[PDB]
Amino acid sequence: KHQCVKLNDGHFMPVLGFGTYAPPEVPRSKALEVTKLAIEAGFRHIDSAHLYNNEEQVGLAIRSKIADGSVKREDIFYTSKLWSTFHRPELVRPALENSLKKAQLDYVDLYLIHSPMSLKPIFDIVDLCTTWEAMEKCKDAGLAKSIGVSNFNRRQLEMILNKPGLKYKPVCNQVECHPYFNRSKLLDFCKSKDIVLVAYSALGSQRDKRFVDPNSPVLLEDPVLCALAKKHKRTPALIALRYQLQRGVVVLAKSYNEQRIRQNVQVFEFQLTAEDMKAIDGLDRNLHYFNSDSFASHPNYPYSD
Ligand SMILES: NC(=O)c1ccc[n+]([C@@H]2O[C@H](COP(=O)([O-])OP(=O)(O)OC[C@H]3O[C@@H](n4cnc5c(N)ncnc54)[C@H](OP(=O)(O)O)[C@@H]3O)[C@@H](O)[C@H]2O)c1
Fold first, then answer.
1. Residue of the nearest CA to atom 7 in ligand 1?
2. Fewest CB atoms within 10 Å of the CB: 12, 35, 240, 303?
3. Which residue segment(s) compose the domain that 98 sits in?
4. What is the distance in A from the centroid of ligand 1 to the CA of 274?
5. How far is the CA of 258 from the centre of ligand 1 (A)?
6. Catalytic residue list contains 301
7. In degrees rounded to 5, what are phi and psi of residue 14?
8. Residue among 250, 255, 264, 269 to mutate when testing ligand 1 (max atoms within 8 A of CB)
């Protein structure tokens, strides 16, 4: 299907998605305005989460673009995510039901485990295979068309894929992925298991002071990204998004700015050569922008491997 990839459960995922997270200081009504502008610009995959405290505004934007005739529900791929205080398996279905009620949708296209780092329902120690069984029952019930995971490393994905009794493989692993942390080996593994890698912080993250070192290089000021932008008469952001599409990664892009939202859909309008991709692959430097004690101290931190 046009500009989508086929998931391993048969559903289709659009290869460019709109990132909806804004920090707390942005008024909640902004997510309504920008999600409507993202749909108007041509985004058809919208990524939210319980954590983002925006599902009611994001859902209203979707319902509004349905009401005015721009799109039908089946034209939109909506993702939400189970937050880490709800890993205990009896909490999974009520958490998804809460997300649906907030968005006023009958189903999500995709429901993810947001992170493998379980928190007190203060860390919690939960066997995530039990969480996954509860995710499977939500796909059986029709609450989520597809289920997947987010922030898992290879060993953590294998624990699910190897589970006795497994009914549904995860359709995706949504992970931090960009030219300073391109996750090649994990991508190869995901490809080998028919699992889609979805990239977040593909434009270098929002640099949130709670978890990103401001000393970290700014991805879009990279001189190779900037040179390739000059060569293609595009921008460093479009070079960073198009790099993902050509390696078979589905890519998210957040923007709350009307011009940049419209700019990002231009990722479909041009392509990069083998030499351009090799120049971009040479930027890999094990730089995860999310780099905090509040993750690294956790018994199931994914960058331990
Ligand atoms: N699963 C998880 O744990 C997880 C973690 C992080 C993110 N995510 C998801 O991934 C989404 C994207 O990741 P992210 O929030 O880290 O942000 P990102 O997509 O890496 O974007 C980073 C910054 O790039 C700027 N930008 C966007 N388009 C641009 C363009 N064409 N030119 C120049 N700058 C541009 C935006 O600022 P403006 O708004 O000012 O344009 C944005 O704040 C999030 O919204 C969320 O949906 C998930």
1. 200
2. 303
3. 1-305
4. 26
5. 14
6. no
7. -65, 135
8. 255
Instruction: Please work out, in degrees rounded to the nearest 5, the angle formed at the alpha carbon of residue 132 by the alpha carbons of 288 and 296.
Output: 25
Cβ within 8 Å of residue 156, ≥6 positions away: 116, 128, 149, 300, 302
**Is residue 48 within 8 Å of residue 54, measured between CB atoms?**
yes
For the chain, the maximum distance between any two Cα atoms, rounded to a whole number of angstroms, is: 53
CA of 7 to the centre of ligand 1 (A): 24
237 in ligand 1 pocket by Cβ < 6 Å? yes
Instruction: Give the total number of structural domains in the chain.
Output: 1
CATH number of the domain where residue 228 is located:
3.20.20.100
Q: Which amino acid is at 104?
A: Q
Q: Is the CB of 205 under 6 A from ligand 1?
A: yes
Structure method:
X-ray
Q: Report which of 179, 176, 183 is spatially closest to residue 205, judged by C-alpha positions.
A: 176
Structure resolution in Å? 1.7
Cβ–ligand 1 distance for 260 under 6 Å, the answer: yes
Q: Determine whether 223 is exposed, middle or buried from the number of CB atoms within 10 Å of its CB (0-12, 13-18, 19+).
A: exposed
Residues in the chain: 305
